[PDB]
């Protein structure tokens, strides 16, 4: 009995990894509105030759590639803005 137990439980664990929360789905996203900051419009009006970003909604449906391109450019702009900053390390004491 002990042998069989030691020979199954880990496998049971990964079964518990896969047959867990198998009842999750998405919801409606049409209620989300758009208030785009105009600096993004400036940046997409600056570099049409390099930035091949399409519309967020084409044919009335969401385009994931274009919005991931937009978040990628947001992260890259953030990267320029933080590498302009000279700070490197962050340290805080919560005991205080």
């Amino acid at each position: 009995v002990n042998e069989t137990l030691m020979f199954l439980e880990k496998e049971r664990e990964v079964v518990s990894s896969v047959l867990s929360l198998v009842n999750q789905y998405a919801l409606d996203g049409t209620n989300v509105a758009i208030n785009i900051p105009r600096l993004l419009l400036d940046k997409i009006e600056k570099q049409m030759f390099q930035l091949h970003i399409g519309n967020v909604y084409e044919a009335g449906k969401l385009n994931l590639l274009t919005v991931i391109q937009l978040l990628n450019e947001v992260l890259k702009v953030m990267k320029y803005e933080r590498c302009q900053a000279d700070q490197a390390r962050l340290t805080v004491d919560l005991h205080y």
Binding site: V15, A26, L70, V92
Partner: protein
Amino acid sequence: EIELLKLEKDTADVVHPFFLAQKCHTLQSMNNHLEAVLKEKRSLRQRLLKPMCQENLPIEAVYHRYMVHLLELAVTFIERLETHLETIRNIPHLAANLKKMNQALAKMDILVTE
């Protein structure tokens, strides 16, 4: 009584109801897990009918929580970029700010002292 207690303690591994109780609880744990597996046999054979179909990609329901959460985090990014931009530009994160609160907490402290 020395012999009787000796034979009672020598048989502690299998006879007494304690270890029987723990092996019983392991049995109900195994039975509950395998019953939760077995109740969804039609769902399991629905998983089994999903090979490497590049034309009709077989998404599942466990990963929906991840994609919902990352989509909502993207939405919260797009909603308030401007606040994050003004927050990073005016003052450094927990640097100059961290310093000034330690020196300016002392003014409320001393105000309480008066």
